[PDB]
Amino acid sequence: PTFTERSQLKYARRLVVKLGSAVITREDNHGLALGRLASIVEQVAECHLEGREVMMVTSGAVAFGKQKLAQELLMSLSMRETLNEPRAAAAVGQSGLMSLYDAMFAQYGVKIAQVLVTKPDFYNEETRNNLFCTLSELISLNIVPIINTNDAVSPPPIKDNDSLSAMLAAEVQADLLILMSDVDGIYNKPPWEDGAKLMHTYTSDSKVKAATWALDRGVSVVICNGMQEKAIKTIIGGRKVGTFFTEATESANAVPVEVMAENARTGSRQMQALTPAQRASAVNTLADLLVSREKFILDANAKDLAEAQKSGLAKPLLSRLSLNPAKLKNLSVGLKQIAEDSHKNVGRVLRRTRLADQLELKQVTVPIGVLLVIFESRPDSLPQVAALAMASANGLLLKGGKEAAHSNKALMELVKEALATVGAEHAVSLVSTREEISDLLSMENHIDLIIPRGSSDLVRSIQQQSLHIPVLGHAEGVCHVYIDRDADLEKALRIARDAKCDYPAACNAMETLLIHEDLMSGAIFGDVCNMLKREGVKIYAGPRLNQQLTFGPPAAKSLKHEYGALECCIEVVPSLDEAINHIHTYGSSHTDVIVTENDAAARQFLGSVDSACVFHNASSRFADGFRFGLGAEVGISTARIHARGPVGVEGLLTTKWILEGQDHAAADFAEGGGRTWLHETLPLD
Amino acid sequence: VAECHLEGREVMMVTSGAVAFGKQKLAQELLMSLSMRETLNEPRAAAAVGQSGLMSLYDAMFAQYGVKIAQVLV
Secondary structure, eight states: OOSSSTTTGOOOOEEEOOOHHHHHHHOOOSSOOHHHHHHHHHHHHHHHHTTEEEOOOOOOOOHHHHHHHHHHHHHSSSSSSOOHHHHHHHHHHHHHHHHHHHHHHTTOOOBBEEEEEEEEGSHHHHHHHHHHHHEEEEEEEETTTTEEEOOOOOOOOOSSSSHHHHHHHHHHTTTEEBBBOOOOOOSOOOOSSOOOOOOOOEEEOHHHHHHHHHHHHHHHHEOBBOOOOOTHHHHHHTTTOOEOOEEEEEEEEOSSSSHHHHHHHHHHHHHHHHHHHHHHHHHHHHHHHHHHHHHHHHHHHHHHHHHHHHHHHHHHHHHTTOOHHHHHHHHHHHHHHHHHHTTSSOOOOOOOEEEEEEEEEEEEEEEEEOOEESSSSSHHHHHHHHHHHHHOOOOOEEOSSSHHHHHHHHHHHHHHHHHHHHSOOOOOOOOOOOOHHHOOOOHHHOOEEEEOOHHHHHHHHHHHHHHSSOOOSSHHHHHHEEEESSHHHHHHHHHIIIIIIIITSSSSSSOOOEEEGGGGGEEEEEEHHHHHHHHTTTEEOOOOHHHOOSSSSOOOOOOTTTOSSEEOOOOEEEHHHHHHHHHHHHHOOOOOOOEEEOHHHHHHHHHHOOOOEEEEEEEEGSSSTTTTTTTTEEEEEHHHHHHOOEEOOOOGEEEEEEESSSSSOOHHHHHHHSSOOEEEEEEOO | OOOHHTTOOOOOOOOOOHHHHHHHHHHHHHHHTSOGGGOOOOHHHHHHHHHHHHHHHHHHHHHHTOOOOOOOOO
C-alpha cells in the first residue's frame, strides 16, 4: 500500500470506483437517482480527462430491471383483471443502464465498454489472465470499462460486487479503491449504540473484510457515502472524508486524541487535592529548572529558529522566535510572582449562609478543567500558561505551531518533569505536529475553553471556525479616543504619542481618533497631524472631516478596518453623545479613553460607554493586566460573559454549591414540617 | 421486426458482428492516441466495445417503436 496519507491521493494514477445499489435507486423505487448518477459520472469524466486511470464497477441492475418489469406486467393484463425474478430484471436493467451511462459519458467525449463477468471466471487462471490483459488494453486505450457481474444468466471469496471490486483492484494493480456505499463511514458500534466515532483513518464487516483482504495486497482502500455530494473530487481533493485505510501510526508516533484529555482530567482531579503550597512548591521548582537548564533550551531555541530562518516565513513570527536569558530571567521572576500570589486562589469560600437549624451552605471556588491553549509559536508563553494551569490546578491541553516545535518539546519535557516531581502525575499533555485544528475543535465534552493567544489571524480563524465551545480572546482591537473641548492640548499630544507611536502592532493599540469639532479650530488638528508626520503616520479621514476640510488627508475604506501599522482613521463630531453613537456603532467595545478636565461630561461618558474598559488621561497600552497589578494574565476577553479584557487567574475558576444538612428534606421545610428559612449571611471565612 | 411483432408474433433476434463494429471504434481510438511525431510516417477488446455500442443503437431504434429490448449474453 504505497499511498498512506490523505495528501498522497493527489498522485493516484489508476483508481477503481465502485457504486452501490443504494446509490442508483431512490427510496420510492420509482426511478433512478439521476442526480447522483450524473454527478458521479461528471466527477469521473473530470478526473479522467485529467489523465487518471479509472474504471467503474456498477451495481443495482436488478432494481432498474424490477421497475421496468413491473411497468410492463401492468401493461399486459386484461382490462377486466385491472379492475380489482432475478435474471429477467437483471438483463433488462443491464441493457437500459448501459444505454444511460453511454449517453451520459458520450456527453463528455469519452467512450465506454460493457464487460460482464461471472464467478467461475476467476477460478480459471487462463480466463483470469485473458480478462486481465483485456482490461489493461482497454484502459491503455483511454476507455472506461464499466464492469459488472453476469447475473443475467448466472447469478452468484467473490460473493458480491464488493469482493469482485477488491479482487479486480488487486489483479489490475490499481492505486486507489473507492467503495462509495450507503453509510458515511465506520464506528466502533452502530449509530443506535454507544460509540458513534468516525474511523477517518483505520488501524488494525463484509465490506471491512474485503477492505482487509485487498489492503493486504498493495492497494489503498477508501469507503465513502453514496449520497455525499462531490464525493470523488473531494476524496481526490485529499480532504478527510470517509474511512481512509492505512497501516498503523501507533502511540510510538502519536496517541490519537482523547487519552491525553482524559489523562489530563484525571491528573487535574489529582492535583485538586494538592492545594497547600504543593503547586506553589511545584512552580518554585519549575522556575528553578527554567533557570537551571536554559543553556539546553537556549541552544534548542537557537537551532530551531535558525532552521525556520531558511524558510523566512514571517518577520513578525521570526522576530517573536527570539529567546534569550533575559527573557528567561523575566519568565522565571514572573513565575515566582505567580508562586507568590497563587496561594489561595482555589477552593476559597465565597458565601457563608445558614437556612435552617444545622442547615448551612457555601459556594466554593473550583478549577474549570480541560484547557486547550492554541497559539502561533511564541514559546515564551508555554511555561507562562503552564504555570497558570498548575497554579489553578486545572489540566491543560497544549497545541502551538510547527515552528520551534523542538524548543516547545524541550519546554514540555521540562515542565513535565517539574510536575511529575510533586503532583504524582504529568497532569498536562502537549500535542503538535499536524493536530488537525478543526477536528479537535469540533470534539466536545472533554475540552472546556479555547484560549487562542498567537495573533489576530488565529482568533479570527477560530471564531469563524469555532462552533459550540467556550472560546476566549478578542477579534480585533478597534480602540477609540476622544478629546473634549475641556482638555488641554499637549496632554492629548503625549497621549496620542503613547497611544499609537508606542507599539502600532499591538492588539490593544488604538486605530482611530475622535475630537470635539469645536476645538478643531485650535490648531490642535494641525499639531497632531504634524506630530503623526513626525512619526510618519499614514492618515485617513472620514465624511465629517472630508466635508470640513478642503484638501485634507485621503479617505477611509471602511470604518471597521484594522491596520496594525502607522495608519489611523480620524473623525470629528460635535456631540459627546454622538461619540457614544459612533463608538457603539463601530467599536469592538474593546477600549476607550477620555481626556478632559470636567468630570460631569467625563463621568456621563464613563457610565454610558460600554467598552470592555475605559480610562481618563491614560493610554490604551495600559491594557495588559500586568500593568493592572493583576499578575500574569492569560489573554484579553471581549466576550460578553464571565470575563472582560484583562483576564487574570480568577478568570480560570468557577464555583460549586455544597451543603451539609442534618437530615433535612425539601417537603420537610414546607408547612408540613417545623422548618424555616434563615438566610443569615454568615461572615465568610 | 417491430412490425411483425406489433402484429403479435413472438420474435427474438440473435445478432452477430460485434467485433467488426468494435474494430472500427478501436482503430479510430488507436489513431487518436499517438504522438504527433509518430503520426508523420484483439478479439475481446473490440468485442466488448462493439457490444456496448451496438446494444445502444438497437435500443434507440427499437424505442422509436415503443417496444423494449434486453441484452442477454451467453
